[PDB]
């Protein structure tokens, strides 16, 4: 599964916290990318691994 979400409110949550973030909001949903190539994601100065 690739990195997907529903709205950008969960993408900007996932970049802030990557351990305590929500995978499922009220109707909104976000899927963490699990893959062999662990892609490094930058969004401004927030960065996850």
């Amino acid at each position: 599964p690739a990195l997907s979400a529903s709205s950008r409110a969960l993408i900007d949550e996932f970049m802030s916290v990557k351990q305590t973030h929500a995978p499922i909001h009220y109707g909104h949903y976000i899927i963490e990318e699990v893959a062999p190539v662990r892609r490094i994601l930058k969004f401004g100065n927030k960065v996850v691994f």
Binding site: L10, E13, I24, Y26, G27, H28, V37
Partner: protein, 49 residues
């Protein structure tokens, strides 16, 4: 020939719908709309850049 090309298949769903008991597990995000009739239209993904 040691620089080979692996080809993974990535999939992600769009426009899904949660069950009617709708929960949340991030107490930080708050949308300014109704939570009960909330469902996504799209899916935000990330590029290679």
């Amino acid at each position: 020939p040691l620089n080979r090309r692996m080809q993974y298949s990535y999939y992600f769903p769009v426009g899904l719908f949660m069950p009617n008991p709708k929960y949340t597990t991030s107490a930080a995000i708050k949308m300014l709309d109704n939570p009960t009739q909330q469902l996504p239209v799209e899916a935000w993904i990330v590029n290679k850049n």
